[PDB]
Symmetry: D2
Subunit: 113 residues, 4 copies
Amino acid sequence: GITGTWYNQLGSTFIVTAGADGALTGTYESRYVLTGRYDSAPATDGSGTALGWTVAWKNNYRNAHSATTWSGQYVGGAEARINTQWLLTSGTTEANAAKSTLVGHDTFTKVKP
Amino acid sequence: GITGTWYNQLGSTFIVTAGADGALTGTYENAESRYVLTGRYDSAPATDGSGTALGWTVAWKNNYRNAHSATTWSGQYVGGAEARINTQWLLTSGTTEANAAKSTLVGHDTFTKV
Amino acid sequence: GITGTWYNQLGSTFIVTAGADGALTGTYESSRYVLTGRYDSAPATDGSGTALGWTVAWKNNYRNAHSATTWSGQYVGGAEARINTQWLLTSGTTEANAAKSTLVGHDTFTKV
Amino acid sequence: GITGTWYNQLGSTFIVTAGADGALTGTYESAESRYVLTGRYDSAPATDGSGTALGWTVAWKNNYRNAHSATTWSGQYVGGAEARINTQWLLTSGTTEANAAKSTLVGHDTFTKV
């Protein structure tokens, strides 16, 4: 269900595998390594499936000295989607610590818009 | 400086290993209160005295418990004598669509080596 | 521009008057609660949006959730005028539960 | 106890008046650094030991400067020996739509009367 190729509202691509253990492994598209966890035994009451992951924005080509974490839930069904909020923290100095973290929201869908 | 055991002020413990690939792996803590964590950190941070960006996720299920929720911490490691990890976190609970708007708590945590 | 009636997608209604002095005052029909806030009364005219924020404390003469929501965002004019926000909802808790006191979310308002 | 002069950890000062029907009015000083604030609070809180829920907004325009941004603080007042206001805040900047995704900062502030 979660396993697959996902797209956010800005055309970013999220390729993930949901492991049996609760593990999330994949790539965020340059391309970056992602890792996280998900609820591998969600409720049956129609509630969504809790999950999150992290990308540290360093690959072989660039380093932005930052990391984004996504926290959200997968809702399966006809138009499967993953609704997240995210926090993007940059490495800063102490004087600048106050403005190190951005907050936003992303919706992922299995159809590219 | 990241590898090891870190403590928050509410007693919570987190043991991490920071691999050279930028991977973070460990547990967040009695067995029934132990959970798996995984994340990423910047393995080649600036040297201007900036901190080291990182993040990690814990889903609150283990073999004994399932809270149908996941927390992600976004923050930075600041080394020195009072080495610290300053984070902001998001806690999302699985909800019906009806109540999703109230699905996500936000907060902050500071972790120390003691 | 900002002054007028605004709707989100989950059936809530906010009526707001944007004052010359940078004040935002009005009503949020969730029943009805007083709102108050501030906006940039001299934005850039380069296409950027107008920063603004407002607060609703969830008490009126009929009820009280012992909570307050604050909305932070920007107005965007044009054919498809919108106010895009992120919000924080904080409830009164004991300090034992103060770490789970605040929810975060997002809301888009249109002139509908 | 909300009414009076408060300080955050970083040096800024916030002067509030708590009104009888839930209004917050006052000034935030980070004269050229002085800004109007406005907000609301729970004027009839819980008598169970819970704090008092509140929020306020500052738009970063005064007679001398304009940042084209606004901060909202959401939190609660905890009266006591060390009476305090614990908040989380969102700072949004006016951006073009292409930059709209990086328009909002999140952080937290604690205020005391000392």
